[PDB]
Write a protein that binds this ligand. Sequence first.
Ligand SMILES: CC(C)=CCC/C(C)=C\CC/C(C)=C\CC/C(C)=C\CC/C(C)=C\CC/C(C)=C\CC/C(C)=C\CC/C(C)=C\COP(=O)(O)O
Length: 374
Amino acid sequence: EYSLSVAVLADSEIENVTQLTSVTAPTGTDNENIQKLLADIKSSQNTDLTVNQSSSYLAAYKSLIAGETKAIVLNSVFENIIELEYPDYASKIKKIYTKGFTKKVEAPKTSKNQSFNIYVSGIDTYGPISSVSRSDVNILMTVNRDTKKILLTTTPADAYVPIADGGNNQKDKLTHAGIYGVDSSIHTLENLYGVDINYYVRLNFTSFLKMIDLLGGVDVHNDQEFSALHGKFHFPVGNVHLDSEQALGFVRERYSLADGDRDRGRNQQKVIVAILQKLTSTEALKNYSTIINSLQDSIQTNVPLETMINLVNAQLESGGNYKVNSQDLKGTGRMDLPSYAMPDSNLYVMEIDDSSLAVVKAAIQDVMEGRKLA
Ligand SMILES: CC(C)=CCC/C(C)=C\CC/C(C)=C\CC/C(C)=C\CC/C(C)=C\CC/C(C)=C\CC/C(C)=C\CC/C(C)=C\COP(=O)(O)O
């Protein structure tokens, strides 16, 4: 659910598209959508516009505010990209023609064998799940139902990788993929790790809170004393029970941890294991429908109902615990590499360590294939 519009400056005398002869747009990277809009304009308004190609939607916007063009095409998805460098962009423009588009995100891929991959996207925002934002949590869960093994692979938010789809396969921090959509994030990680991602789950701060509450909190073993959210929550060494708000702090704190983002990644993994322990309780399995009802409006997923039912009932009958292992893609922080989405800013990114990538890829394959980890 997105839209393309013809936009002009807020104070432009232009009121409707029939007054235009041309429009500036990135036909180099969004030609299909753009051409649909132009065909729709020619049909309902009998107006044929020539296109002044721009290198991107950001570039088109710059041209507009610079007075170098009268009108641009704007794909709503990319308004969120423009906002990264121009937070007040919305107030600078008006829209004089709008076309709604619709697309389903990733279709689910059913695995032909005992193993599947689920991508967990954690969005940096409160409120309705439909809110567009970057994906600061990017965890792949490789599950093998035969060996009863799970592998959690964390990819840091700042990982500098080719971003698929809207990212135009250009390098940027992984978290930006989330802005283009869950599709972009999924395809980005499929390409990086060379595996099919069967399903995804997408949730934000508000979704996470409801889930923890619903489950009655979660229990973890904390390895190092730390505090989160400017000292609001304190976590001692030892077994800790986390309510919704504590758990959210627990998975967010980074800077004060001995190993920074890597330790935060491990804390997130601890919480996932704890959630899984609650979700595979007999009470939870028996009452899965209530859990679906309770979380459906705040958590997006393409896992089919039929699949959930199979997974739940299989666990109900067979019982038995999954063993969980974890890993994280390693790299080196840098300030001198360009961000495709934010070309004018110096950003911190993590340049991937190639030897680590090889190891991470091999481990995913091992668990999928039922081989022991190195
Ligand atoms: C289905 C069933 C009952 C059994 C199936 C059999 C088994 C054992 C496994 C099958 C797997 C299945 C079906 C489901 C697994 C899913 C599962 C158990 C748990 C899912 C956990 C989920 C959905 C989310 C966890 C994500 C998590 C830990 C945190 C979310 C992160 C969020 C929302 C925000 C983080 C943002 C962040 C890192 C920092 C905040 O930003 P700043 O403050 O600016 O720095």
